[PDB]
């Protein structure tokens, strides 16, 4: 029931987007962060600050423990949880319960943060990234298999200035214009090939390999647009020249009373036909974020992450079955009756290498 899945997300890019899920027998209601950048389903399993409730396994008659635990480290944060299996229902979209793996967190650090409204995480990336190993069936693999849905999901985030997670399909009401598809280069993260970044129509002076150092990924669980340091510095220099040192490093807010003074930022992606590319473009409203304002781009060590900053401009189709990611401008991506994103193409890729991925 894809229509019942519209508006099933609450929250925003800073505190993440989250889905209501019902777990165990009788069901316990939890609020679960949608993370296309990881592959484990995990919930709080004990009281903690910054959460109101947790999943108590002793109260579910269908819970079964797998008899082991797992630690998951991210760059910022980590958790250790017992691994078990239980029945889950997603009230908005499905008529039935499904058996899934579930990790219940008994220790964490810098994972549950102040201001968050979620108490668990739904990892929608591929088997490759599941811990302790790829044999721990992912939530979406369980769902596709047990709910008879196509191997596709899609996401509209509406909180620039909730949203929708469509499990099994694409909802036409959630985008305007055409959908453009870029190939998934490797099935772990949603890794896609970036060919070029432009700032106000000016291309940066960088080999396309730099944008894929060592991967460009689409990740709903990352707040900002994160760029490898060398790309970040080039971006910052272009955005500054076309317009507070602490502001670029996010260590400071910037205040007025603003947007007309800043350039559009374009990311070129290779089309499914390799001789063509398209571009997704964010306007200043997406990256000069009202909070006074914060800079919505930050440095990364080894990944270009198309986080919520950019996804809030787009309907994003994670088409696993056809190994491609789709993008279309989002109707909800407007601020004060003005679109804050664009998509266009085709452009020729004749002057770019046939593979920008190292």
């Amino acid at each position: 029931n894809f229509l019942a899945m519209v508006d099933n997300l609450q929250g925003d890019s800073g505190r993440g987007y989250y889905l209501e899920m019902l777990i165990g027998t009788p069901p316990q209601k939890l609020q679960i962060l949608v993370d296309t950048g990881s592959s484990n389903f995990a919930v709080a399993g004990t009281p903690h600050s910054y959460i109101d409730t947790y999943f108590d396994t002793e109260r579910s008659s269908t819970y079964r423990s797998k008899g082991f635990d797992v630690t998951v480290k991210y760059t910022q944060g980590s958790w250790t949880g017992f691994v078990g299996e239980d029945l889950v229902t997603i009230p908005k979209g499905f008529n039935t319960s499904f058996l899934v793996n579930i990790a219940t967190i008994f220790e964490s650090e810098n994972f549950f943060l102040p201001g968050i409204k979620w108490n668990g995480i739904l990892g929608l990336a591929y088997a490759t990234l599941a811990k302790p190993s790829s044999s721990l069936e992912t939530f979406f693999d369980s769902l596709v298999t047990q709910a008879n849905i196509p191997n596709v999901f899609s996401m509209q985030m509406c909180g620039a200035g909730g949203g929708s997670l469509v499990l099994g399909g694409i909802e036409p009401s959630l985008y305007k214009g055409d959908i453009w598809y870029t190939p998934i280069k490797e099935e772990w993260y949603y890794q896609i090939e970036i060919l070029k970044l432009e700032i106000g129509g000016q291309s940066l002076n960088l080999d396309c390999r730099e944008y894929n150092a060592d991967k460009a990924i689409v990740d709903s669980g990352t707040t900002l647009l994160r760029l490898p340091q060398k790309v970040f510095d080039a971006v910052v220099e272009a955005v500054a020249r076309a317009s507070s040192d602490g502001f670029w490093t996010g260590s400071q807010l910037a205040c007025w009373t603003p947007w007309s003074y800043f350039p559009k930022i374009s990311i070129y992606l290779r089309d499914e036909n390799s001789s063509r590319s398209f571009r997704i473009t964010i306007l200043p409203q997406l990256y000069i974020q009202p909070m006074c304002y914060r800079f919505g781009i930050s440095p990364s060590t080894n990944a270009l992450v198309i986080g919520a900053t950019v996804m809030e401009g787009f309907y994003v189709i994670f088409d696993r079955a056809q190994k491609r990611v789709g993008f279309a401008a989002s109707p909800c991506a407007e601020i004060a009756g003005a679109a804050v994103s664009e998509i266009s193409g085709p452009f020729s890729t004749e002057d770019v290498a046939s593979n920008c991925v190292p």
Partner: nanobody
Amino acid sequence: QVQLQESGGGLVQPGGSLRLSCAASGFTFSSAIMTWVRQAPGKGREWVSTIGSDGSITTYADSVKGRFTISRDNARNTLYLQMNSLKPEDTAVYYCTSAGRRGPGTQVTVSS
């Protein structure tokens, strides 16, 4: 390498019965949720039954409830599907599946 290998299909009569097996290697089978899915000619994929790693939780599609029995022998790394009161519309390839992977399948043909 993870391997799954179904067997035991073939031709049966309406009202007949079969035991399917799925042999698993290359992963810790006794820790895996295991699923049977089938694909009938001219139809999309249809989930049949799921069984939790320890065998105690089993779920079934309404179309097979009360006719089919899923089970597993963890010590032999074997998943089973025992099917009673077979119907022509049970004609399908049956696959065992775990963690995105599936075996080559086994064909059940139910013919009048």
